[PDB]
Amino acid sequence: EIPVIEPLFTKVTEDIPGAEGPVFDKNGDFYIVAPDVEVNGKPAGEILRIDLKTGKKTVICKPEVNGYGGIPAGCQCDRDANQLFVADMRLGLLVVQTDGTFEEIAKKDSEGRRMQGCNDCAFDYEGNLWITAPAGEVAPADATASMQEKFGSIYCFTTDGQMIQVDTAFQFPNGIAVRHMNDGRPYQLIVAEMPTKKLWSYDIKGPAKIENKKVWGHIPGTHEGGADGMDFDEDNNLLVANWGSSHIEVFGPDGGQPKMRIRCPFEKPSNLHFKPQTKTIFVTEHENNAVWKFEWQRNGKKQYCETLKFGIF
Ligand SMILES: [Ca+2]
Ligand SMILES: [Ca+2]
């Protein structure tokens, strides 16, 4: 059987509807998003900053465009500026400042097609942002998801400002991650297709250039849910929240079947993120709509925001 560890989890904060997108900025501040917040049945998602000591929450942004509320669901911190890139299920891709101001990156992609709602994203070390888009067209267009139909797409927002659809026909693409060589070269993209219990891989040949698509890993279980958020640890092991399984799966560098499983004190882990330079992993979950933390066996893989702009001196 696959080895299972049961680390001690510590509650961080609660009352976060749809708790998702955990992320640390360049100053070490912690943020999470609340995509499930609604006001009178209408989307009113929030981006919050969490005090690690008290667990107190501060709403920094409640995105809305032309009267349509956003559904912020995933985040990545930029490197050269302390700003957050946020995947929004209703607005697409947003760039949010610590002061709460935000900008919608694109209404349409590089081919002029209306943008699809986004769920999560991952920066590669070259500054390109790989994004999952499981939702239908962004507001004002009517909402819809790809849990059944295969119209979920993947985008790559390049450093040159191009929003390129790099693949599509996915059944609710969710988590996403980029594997790098030790010299910093991005070479593999991993995409979670939630309901199908599959993790897909592609070889990265350059900015917005992916090929050799294949099924890379298998997510355990027949439960409703599947792979949600993911991140690499420093040894390139891929940790994946398996929503509905009560576990976070751990895949070795070669994928396939998980090499280890991490038991959680809740059934629906949605996402995770390492605290910089530590073995501490923060986990968002939908059973209690809260955030927790636990200690992993090693530090996490550095996020783009922690990398050296000029290389190793
Ligand atoms: Ca997600
Ligand atoms: Ca993460």
Curated annotation (Swiss-Prot):
Summary of temperature dependence: Optimum temperature is 35 degrees Celsius.
Result after altering Q76W: No effect on activity
Metal-binding as UniProt keyword: yes
Consequence when changing H286A: 90% decrease in activity
Impact after mutating F172V: 46% decrease in activity
Active-site residues, record numbering mapped to chain: H286 (proton acceptor)
Effect after changing Q303W: 3% decrease in activity
Biotechnology and industry use: Has potential application in bio-remediation by detoxification of organo-phosphates used in insecticides or nerve agents used in chemical warfare such as soman, tabun and sarin.
Activity regulation description: Inhibited by chelating agents.
UniProt binding sites for Ca(2+) 1: E20, N119, N174, D228
Effect of N119D: 96% decrease in activity. 100% decrease in activity
Co-factor binding details: Binds 2 calcium ions per subunit.
The protein's required cofactors: Ca(2+)
Annotated consequence of substituting H286L: 21% decrease in activity
Effect after changing Q76Y: 6% increase in activity
Outcome of swapping H286W: 44% decrease in activity
Gene3D superfamilies: TolB, C-terminal domain (2.120.10.30)
Effect of F172S: 68% decrease in activity
GO molecular function, a single term: calcium ion binding
Positions bound to Ca(2+) 2: D231, L272, H273
Enzyme Commission code(s) on record: 3.8.2.2
Impact after mutating D120F: 100% decrease in activity
The protein's role, per its UniProt record: Biological function and substrate unknown. However, it is capable of acting on phosphorus anhydride bonds (such as phosphorus-halide and phosphorus-cyanide) in organophosphorus compounds (including nerve gases).
Subunit structure: Monomer.
UniProt name for this protein: Diisopropyl-fluorophosphatase
Organism, scientific name: Loligo vulgaris
Lineage: Eukaryota, Metazoa, Spiralia, Lophotrochozoa, Mollusca
